[PDB]
Amino acid sequence: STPGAQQVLFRTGIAAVNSTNHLRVYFQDVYGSIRESLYEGSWANGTEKNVIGNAKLGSPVAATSKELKHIRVYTLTEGNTLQEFAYDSGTGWYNGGLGGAKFQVAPYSCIAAVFLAGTDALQLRIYAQKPDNTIQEYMWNGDGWKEGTNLGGALPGTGIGATSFRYTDYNGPSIRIWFQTDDLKLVQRAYDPHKGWYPDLVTIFDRAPPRTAIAATSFGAGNSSIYMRIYFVNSDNTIWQVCWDHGKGYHDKGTITPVIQGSEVAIISWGSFANNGPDLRLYFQNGTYISAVSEWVWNRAHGSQLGRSALPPA
């Protein structure tokens, strides 16, 4: 190991945001502070210096962005209420309003968040697990944080994957959420503009480890067409990938790369098959320098392989 790697929490929360190829990765250090590492052609940051707040140790870590002009990052306080670190261009890091709502959630609750797609309006949707084990949606629509739809019961401490996209033929954003149920299945819930939240749950994986990490993206939205990728950590100590391709549906899944037992996961994407892509970047812990975060890479030219071994500060 190194001193840098040694600062990264074992089984830390990982989130990432991007504006095409420019990337930020979010994690928790061993002291409870949330840090940002940074790629604009070269890796950098992650240090004591690049801290954007504190959260309880073992806290989930979720993040979503509007390019890199708006970033929002979500963790749990020491009182297990949801909080938010915000970044706008020209303003920097600050404390978002979410913490002032004091939304109590299960202390084992996970988080996901998305900016709603195909608008310039800053509209946000955070997903978390209340103490009764239901998945609650929290909305920001410019008029304050307020509770939204409850999507139901899941496994206590289930992973929560989220993504949004806009069908170019339709009038508003779609949202797709993925979590784990009591029976250990992994399931999807779906929201479409024309129809709100559909009532049915779709199964995507039959049995996964209890509380396995779940992380999701989508890209290449067209007319009534989309592509999605879901990732989780399966019983064999690896990330597996579930594919939704337009025209194929849920047509494929398998293993991608090894991870440490219980490792967390984050995924970002950009581009499309239609325009010399897509690009996919995965972040996890696989034991590099013991505790360092590692990267896995997809692009159309170079294909699929491990990217940066040991993210900063390692």
Short mmCIF file of C-alpha atoms in Angstrom, two decimals:
data_model
loop_
_atom_site.label_atom_id
_atom_site.label_comp_id
_atom_site.label_asym_id
_atom_site.label_seq_id
_atom_site.Cartn_x
_atom_site.Cartn_y
_atom_site.Cartn_z
CA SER A 1 0.00 0.00 0.00
CA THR A 2 0.88 3.73 0.14
CA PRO A 3 -0.20 6.42 2.58
CA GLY A 4 -2.68 7.70 -0.02
CA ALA A 5 -4.34 4.37 -0.58
CA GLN A 6 -4.32 3.88 3.15
CA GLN A 7 -6.61 6.93 3.50
CA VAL A 8 -9.44 5.34 1.43
CA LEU A 9 -12.05 3.57 3.48
CA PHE A 10 -12.27 -0.20 2.94
CA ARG A 11 -15.63 -0.70 1.20
CA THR A 12 -16.14 2.99 0.87
CA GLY A 13 -19.04 4.51 -0.98
CA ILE A 14 -18.20 5.38 -4.53
CA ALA A 15 -20.02 7.80 -6.86
CA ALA A 16 -18.95 9.47 -10.08
CA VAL A 17 -20.13 12.21 -12.43
CA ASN A 18 -19.08 13.35 -15.85
CA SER A 19 -19.33 15.71 -18.72
CA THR A 20 -18.33 13.43 -21.56
CA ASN A 21 -14.68 12.44 -20.89
CA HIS A 22 -14.09 14.84 -17.90
CA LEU A 23 -14.72 12.88 -14.71
CA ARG A 24 -15.09 13.20 -10.99
CA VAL A 25 -15.04 10.28 -8.50
CA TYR A 26 -16.52 10.59 -4.97
CA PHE A 27 -15.40 8.57 -1.91
CA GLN A 28 -15.04 8.54 1.83
CA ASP A 29 -11.72 8.56 3.59
CA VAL A 30 -10.97 6.79 6.90
CA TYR A 31 -11.88 9.88 8.88
CA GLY A 32 -15.47 10.27 7.53
CA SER A 33 -14.65 13.05 5.10
CA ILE A 34 -15.90 12.90 1.55
CA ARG A 35 -13.31 13.67 -1.08
CA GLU A 36 -13.21 14.31 -4.83
CA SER A 37 -10.72 12.89 -7.29
CA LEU A 38 -10.54 14.39 -10.78
CA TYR A 39 -9.79 13.48 -14.40
CA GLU A 40 -9.39 16.09 -17.12
CA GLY A 41 -6.77 14.13 -19.13
CA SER A 42 -4.71 13.22 -16.07
CA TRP A 43 -5.76 11.86 -12.73
CA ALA A 44 -5.36 14.17 -9.75
CA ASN A 45 -6.67 15.30 -6.33
CA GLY A 46 -8.35 12.91 -3.83
CA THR A 47 -6.24 14.40 -0.98
CA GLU A 48 -7.01 15.95 2.44
CA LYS A 49 -7.24 19.11 0.40
CA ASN A 50 -10.16 18.04 -1.89
CA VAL A 51 -12.77 17.46 0.79
CA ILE A 52 -16.36 18.49 0.19
CA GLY A 53 -17.86 17.74 3.61
CA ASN A 54 -18.29 15.00 6.15
CA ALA A 55 -20.68 12.22 6.66
CA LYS A 56 -21.01 9.35 9.06
CA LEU A 57 -18.50 6.54 8.53
CA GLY A 58 -19.82 3.72 6.29
CA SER A 59 -22.22 6.23 4.77
CA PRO A 60 -23.59 5.69 1.38
CA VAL A 61 -22.31 8.05 -1.27
CA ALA A 62 -24.49 9.06 -4.31
CA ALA A 63 -23.83 11.71 -6.95
CA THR A 64 -25.40 13.09 -10.16
CA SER A 65 -24.58 16.03 -12.32
CA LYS A 66 -25.64 18.40 -15.10
CA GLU A 67 -22.41 18.15 -17.12
CA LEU A 68 -19.89 19.62 -14.65
CA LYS A 69 -21.76 22.97 -14.22
CA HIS A 70 -23.96 21.35 -11.54
CA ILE A 71 -22.88 18.60 -9.19
CA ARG A 72 -24.78 17.24 -6.21
CA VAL A 73 -23.53 14.57 -3.83
CA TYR A 74 -25.65 12.77 -1.22
CA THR A 75 -24.68 11.06 2.01
CA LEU A 76 -26.10 10.34 5.50
CA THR A 77 -25.44 12.61 8.54
CA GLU A 78 -24.52 11.12 11.94
CA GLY A 79 -28.24 11.44 12.72
CA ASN A 80 -29.10 9.43 9.63
CA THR A 81 -30.77 12.20 7.78
CA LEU A 82 -30.02 12.83 4.11
CA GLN A 83 -27.63 15.64 3.26
CA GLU A 84 -26.22 17.16 0.12
CA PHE A 85 -22.96 18.82 -0.97
CA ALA A 86 -23.53 21.14 -3.85
CA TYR A 87 -21.38 22.59 -6.56
CA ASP A 88 -22.32 25.20 -9.17
CA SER A 89 -19.89 26.81 -11.62
CA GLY A 90 -18.66 30.13 -10.35
CA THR A 91 -19.75 29.36 -6.73
CA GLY A 92 -17.86 26.25 -5.61
CA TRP A 93 -18.75 23.74 -2.89
CA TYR A 94 -21.42 24.43 -0.28
CA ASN A 95 -24.05 22.80 1.84
CA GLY A 96 -27.24 22.09 -0.15
CA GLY A 97 -30.71 22.54 1.41
CA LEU A 98 -31.54 18.82 1.65
CA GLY A 99 -30.13 18.52 5.25
CA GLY A 100 -32.56 21.18 6.52
CA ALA A 101 -35.54 18.96 5.73
CA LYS A 102 -34.07 16.39 8.14
CA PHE A 103 -35.39 13.42 6.25
CA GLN A 104 -34.91 10.47 8.64
CA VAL A 105 -34.00 7.19 6.93
CA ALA A 106 -32.86 3.71 8.00
CA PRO A 107 -29.26 3.97 9.20
CA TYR A 108 -28.32 1.13 6.79
CA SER A 109 -30.09 2.97 3.91
CA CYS A 110 -28.42 3.42 0.59
CA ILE A 111 -28.80 6.35 -1.75
CA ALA A 112 -29.06 7.09 -5.40
CA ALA A 113 -29.77 10.42 -7.15
CA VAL A 114 -30.32 11.75 -10.63
CA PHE A 115 -30.85 14.99 -12.44
CA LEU A 116 -33.95 14.54 -14.58
CA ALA A 117 -33.06 14.44 -18.27
CA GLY A 118 -33.96 16.48 -21.35
CA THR A 119 -34.61 19.70 -19.40
CA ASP A 120 -32.39 22.70 -18.49
CA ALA A 121 -34.43 23.07 -15.33
CA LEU A 122 -32.58 21.66 -12.30
CA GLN A 123 -34.98 18.92 -11.27
CA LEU A 124 -33.69 16.30 -8.84
CA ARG A 125 -34.81 12.90 -7.63
CA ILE A 126 -33.10 11.16 -4.68
CA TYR A 127 -33.98 7.59 -3.69
CA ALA A 128 -33.52 6.05 -0.21
CA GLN A 129 -34.89 3.53 2.26
CA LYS A 130 -36.94 4.66 5.18
CA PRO A 131 -36.84 2.72 8.47
CA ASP A 132 -39.83 0.61 7.40
CA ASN A 133 -37.74 -0.64 4.40
CA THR A 134 -39.70 1.09 1.71
CA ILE A 135 -37.90 3.00 -1.01
CA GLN A 136 -38.95 6.64 -0.77
CA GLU A 137 -38.52 9.16 -3.54
CA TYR A 138 -37.52 12.76 -2.65
CA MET A 139 -38.16 15.54 -5.24
CA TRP A 140 -36.60 18.93 -5.86
CA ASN A 141 -38.48 20.86 -8.54
CA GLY A 142 -37.36 24.40 -7.65
CA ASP A 143 -40.03 24.75 -4.85
CA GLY A 144 -38.30 22.99 -1.96
CA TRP A 145 -37.52 19.37 -1.13
CA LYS A 146 -40.61 17.28 -0.73
CA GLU A 147 -41.40 13.59 -0.49
CA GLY A 148 -42.60 12.02 -3.69
CA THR A 149 -43.72 8.53 -4.56
CA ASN A 150 -43.02 5.49 -2.40
CA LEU A 151 -41.97 2.55 -4.54
CA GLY A 152 -42.33 -0.07 -1.84
CA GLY A 153 -40.43 -2.50 0.36
CA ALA A 154 -36.99 -3.79 -0.40
CA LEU A 155 -34.28 -5.71 1.45
CA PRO A 156 -33.07 -3.75 4.50
CA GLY A 157 -29.83 -2.08 3.29
CA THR A 158 -30.52 -2.88 -0.38
CA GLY A 159 -28.37 -1.23 -3.09
CA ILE A 160 -30.19 1.38 -5.10
CA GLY A 161 -29.37 2.05 -8.71
CA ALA A 162 -30.91 4.98 -10.60
CA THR A 163 -30.80 6.60 -14.04
CA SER A 164 -32.90 8.96 -16.18
CA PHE A 165 -33.08 9.63 -19.85
CA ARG A 166 -35.48 11.35 -22.28
CA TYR A 167 -37.11 9.58 -25.20
CA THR A 168 -36.76 12.18 -27.96
CA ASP A 169 -40.36 11.53 -29.06
CA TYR A 170 -41.85 12.01 -25.54
CA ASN A 171 -42.59 15.09 -23.37
CA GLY A 172 -40.55 14.50 -20.19
CA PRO A 173 -37.91 12.43 -18.57
CA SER A 174 -37.95 8.75 -17.91
CA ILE A 175 -36.55 7.26 -14.69
CA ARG A 176 -35.57 3.69 -13.91
CA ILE A 177 -34.72 2.40 -10.44
CA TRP A 178 -33.25 -0.93 -9.36
CA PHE A 179 -33.02 -2.57 -5.95
CA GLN A 180 -33.12 -5.87 -4.14
CA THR A 181 -36.20 -7.42 -2.65
CA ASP A 182 -36.68 -9.60 0.43
CA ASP A 183 -36.46 -12.75 -1.72
CA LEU A 184 -32.90 -11.63 -2.79
CA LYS A 185 -34.02 -10.97 -6.42
CA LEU A 186 -32.84 -7.76 -8.10
CA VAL A 187 -35.74 -5.83 -9.59
CA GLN A 188 -36.45 -2.69 -11.70
CA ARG A 189 -39.15 -0.03 -11.30
CA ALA A 190 -39.99 2.27 -14.17
CA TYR A 191 -41.31 5.77 -14.67
CA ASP A 192 -42.38 7.14 -18.06
CA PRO A 193 -43.80 10.59 -18.71
CA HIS A 194 -46.97 9.59 -20.58
CA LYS A 195 -47.85 7.10 -17.81
CA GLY A 196 -46.20 7.95 -14.46
CA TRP A 197 -44.80 5.07 -12.39
CA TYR A 198 -45.86 1.65 -13.79
CA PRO A 199 -47.12 -0.63 -11.02
CA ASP A 200 -45.22 -3.77 -12.03
CA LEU A 201 -41.72 -4.79 -10.90
CA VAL A 202 -39.54 -6.39 -13.52
CA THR A 203 -36.98 -8.99 -12.39
CA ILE A 204 -33.45 -8.48 -13.80
CA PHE A 205 -31.40 -10.93 -11.73
CA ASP A 206 -32.75 -13.97 -9.93
CA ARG A 207 -30.59 -14.10 -6.73
CA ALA A 208 -27.80 -11.72 -5.53
CA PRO A 209 -25.85 -11.39 -2.29
CA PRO A 210 -27.70 -9.62 0.52
CA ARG A 211 -27.17 -5.86 0.25
CA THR A 212 -25.00 -6.22 -2.83
CA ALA A 213 -23.98 -2.90 -4.39
CA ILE A 214 -26.21 -1.74 -7.31
CA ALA A 215 -25.26 0.96 -9.86
CA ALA A 216 -26.82 1.94 -13.15
CA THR A 217 -26.53 4.03 -16.30
CA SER A 218 -28.18 4.56 -19.61
CA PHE A 219 -27.12 6.30 -22.86
CA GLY A 220 -28.03 6.69 -26.56
CA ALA A 221 -31.65 7.70 -26.04
CA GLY A 222 -33.64 7.88 -29.26
CA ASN A 223 -37.29 7.76 -30.26
CA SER A 224 -38.81 5.20 -27.90
CA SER A 225 -35.30 3.71 -27.73
CA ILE A 226 -32.69 3.55 -25.01
CA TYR A 227 -29.66 1.57 -23.77
CA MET A 228 -29.03 0.62 -20.14
CA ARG A 229 -26.41 -1.13 -18.14
CA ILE A 230 -26.86 -2.39 -14.58
CA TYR A 231 -24.02 -3.54 -12.34
CA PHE A 232 -23.86 -5.42 -9.04
CA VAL A 233 -21.53 -7.61 -7.07
CA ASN A 234 -22.39 -11.29 -7.37
CA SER A 235 -21.72 -14.27 -5.15
CA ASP A 236 -18.38 -14.95 -6.96
CA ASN A 237 -16.73 -11.69 -5.73
CA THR A 238 -17.05 -9.92 -9.08
CA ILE A 239 -19.09 -7.15 -10.67
CA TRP A 240 -21.55 -8.67 -13.17
CA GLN A 241 -23.19 -6.56 -15.92
CA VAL A 242 -26.87 -6.75 -17.00
CA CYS A 243 -27.55 -5.34 -20.50
CA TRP A 244 -30.71 -3.71 -21.82
CA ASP A 245 -30.22 -3.03 -25.53
CA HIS A 246 -33.04 -1.41 -27.54
CA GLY A 247 -34.49 -4.13 -29.73
CA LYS A 248 -33.16 -6.86 -27.45
CA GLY A 249 -34.47 -5.87 -23.98
CA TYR A 250 -32.86 -7.69 -21.06
CA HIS A 251 -30.85 -9.95 -23.38
CA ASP A 252 -27.51 -10.46 -21.64
CA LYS A 253 -25.63 -10.63 -18.41
CA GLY A 254 -22.29 -11.79 -17.12
CA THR A 255 -19.17 -11.15 -15.11
CA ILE A 256 -16.88 -8.19 -15.88
CA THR A 257 -14.05 -7.94 -13.28
CA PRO A 258 -13.08 -9.04 -9.77
CA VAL A 259 -13.67 -6.94 -6.71
CA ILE A 260 -12.95 -7.22 -3.05
CA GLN A 261 -15.59 -8.90 -0.98
CA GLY A 262 -18.46 -6.45 -0.33
CA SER A 263 -16.95 -3.75 -2.66
CA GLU A 264 -19.06 -0.80 -3.70
CA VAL A 265 -19.62 0.29 -7.33
CA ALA A 266 -20.22 3.37 -9.52
CA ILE A 267 -20.77 3.79 -13.19
CA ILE A 268 -20.87 6.67 -15.63
CA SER A 269 -21.38 6.74 -19.37
CA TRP A 270 -21.51 9.06 -22.42
CA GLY A 271 -21.92 9.08 -26.17
CA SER A 272 -23.76 6.42 -28.13
CA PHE A 273 -23.30 3.56 -30.61
CA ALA A 274 -24.57 6.03 -33.24
CA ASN A 275 -21.54 8.39 -32.77
CA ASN A 276 -18.26 6.45 -32.20
CA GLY A 277 -19.05 5.10 -28.71
CA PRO A 278 -20.38 4.57 -26.10
CA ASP A 279 -17.86 5.10 -23.31
CA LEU A 280 -18.28 3.39 -19.95
CA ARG A 281 -16.18 3.91 -16.79
CA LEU A 282 -16.58 1.71 -13.68
CA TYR A 283 -15.14 2.39 -10.20
CA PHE A 284 -14.58 -0.12 -7.46
CA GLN A 285 -12.19 -1.64 -4.97
CA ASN A 286 -10.38 -4.83 -6.09
CA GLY A 287 -7.54 -4.84 -3.63
CA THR A 288 -5.19 -2.58 -5.60
CA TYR A 289 -2.81 -1.17 -3.03
CA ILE A 290 -5.23 -2.96 -0.74
CA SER A 291 -7.65 -0.07 -0.31
CA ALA A 292 -7.25 2.01 -3.50
CA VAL A 293 -10.13 2.59 -5.89
CA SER A 294 -9.68 0.99 -9.33
CA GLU A 295 -11.13 1.85 -12.72
CA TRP A 296 -12.59 -0.37 -15.47
CA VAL A 297 -12.92 1.04 -19.02
CA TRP A 298 -15.10 0.57 -22.08
CA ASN A 299 -14.84 2.44 -25.41
CA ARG A 300 -15.42 1.41 -29.00
CA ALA A 301 -11.78 1.75 -30.20
CA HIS A 302 -9.85 0.15 -27.33
CA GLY A 303 -12.63 -2.14 -26.13
CA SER A 304 -12.88 -3.43 -22.60
CA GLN A 305 -10.12 -3.53 -20.01
CA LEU A 306 -8.93 -2.23 -16.64
CA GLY A 307 -8.15 1.47 -16.70
CA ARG A 308 -6.37 3.36 -13.99
CA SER A 309 -5.04 0.98 -11.36
CA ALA A 310 -5.13 3.18 -8.35
CA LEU A 311 -7.13 6.38 -8.37
CA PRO A 312 -5.78 9.31 -6.39
CA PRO A 313 -4.77 9.74 -3.65
CA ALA A 314 -3.20 6.28 -4.00
#
